[PDB]
Amino acid sequence: GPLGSPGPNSHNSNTPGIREAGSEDIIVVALYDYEAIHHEDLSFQKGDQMVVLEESGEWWKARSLATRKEGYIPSNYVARVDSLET
């Protein structure tokens, strides 16, 4: 008896978990690489997008949207996806 792959008695397909909206999910990107100079901060890399969660000062709470890490981050290091030149 020759070899072969799996093969169930039925088949189906649909789109995957593709996202929506943006109005209340501040996607920023890191302008530069950062490595928590002082306590309670995220360490991110240049071109890490992050979902900002609080924005009330020069430092913002965010989550690395590539890796689901969280922390405060420097707003000078960073920039809204909606505000890029690309």
Partner: peptide, 12 residues
Amino acid sequence: HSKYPLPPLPSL
């Protein structure tokens, strides 16, 4: 927060 007067930006 405003814990520090921002980090020192890179060499660019």
